[PDB]
Amino acid sequence: QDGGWSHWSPWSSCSVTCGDGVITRIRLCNSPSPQMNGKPCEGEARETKACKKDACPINGGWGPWSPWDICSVTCGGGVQKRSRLCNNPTPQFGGKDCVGDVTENQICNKQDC
Ligand SMILES: *[C@H]1O[C@@H](C)[C@@H](O)[C@@H](O)[C@@H]1O
Ligand SMILES: *[C@H]1O[C@@H](C)[C@@H](O)[C@@H](O)[C@@H]1O
């Protein structure tokens, strides 16, 4: 009794919901399975195909902070600024916006005036 392949199983769904992945389907050497010294089934027991979905969301990421602006003062109470860019990367395909402020403030040179 030589082995015989069962019918293919239904194709699975895409391995991913976005971007590229694969759909798989399987067979069993059980229709009939091989007996002792009978020929085993010839071929593949699994078949992986490829599926392509829409691009995955790209969440925003902050770029480097700009250098601190020079202090508005040399003694008592200064305020210097600093800025950011949400373009490393820029949000795309429904990705989340960067979290946080685009600009930063801080007191400086607050000392003996
Ligand atoms: C599965 O992957 C996530 C990241 C989103 O792209 C969903 O829309 C998709 O179903
Ligand atoms: C700037 O502030 C003035 C008042 C002086 O104290 C300078 O020495 C400082 O750089």
Structure tokens that stand for 107 in this block: 């007191």
Same fold, 1-56 and 57-113: yes
The tokens for 108 are 């400086």
- Rounded to whole angstroms, how far apart are CA atoms 69 and 80? 5
Mutate to test the pocket of ligand 1, among 13, 17, 59, 96 (most ligand atoms within 8 A of CB): 17
Name the residue ranges covered by the structural domains of the chain.
Answer: 1-56, 57-113
Domain at 57-113, CATH class: mainly beta
CB 79 within 8 A of CB 106: yes
Helix/strand/coil for 87: coil
Q: CB under 8 Å to 50, separation ≥6 — which residues? A: 20, 21, 22, 23
Other Cβ atoms closer than 10 A to 98: 20
| Nearest-angstrom CA–CA distance, 26 and 43 | 12
Residue type, 105: N
Q: How much distance in Å is there from the Cα of 94 to the middle of ligand 1?
A: 10
Query: Among residues 2, 3, 17, 5, which one has the least CA distance to residue 47?
Result: 5
Q: Which CATH number fits domain 1-56: 3.20.20.450, 2.40.50.140, 3.20.20.140, 2.20.100.10?
A: 2.20.100.10
CA distance 7 to 96: 45
Residue positions counted in the chain: 113
Experimental method: X-ray
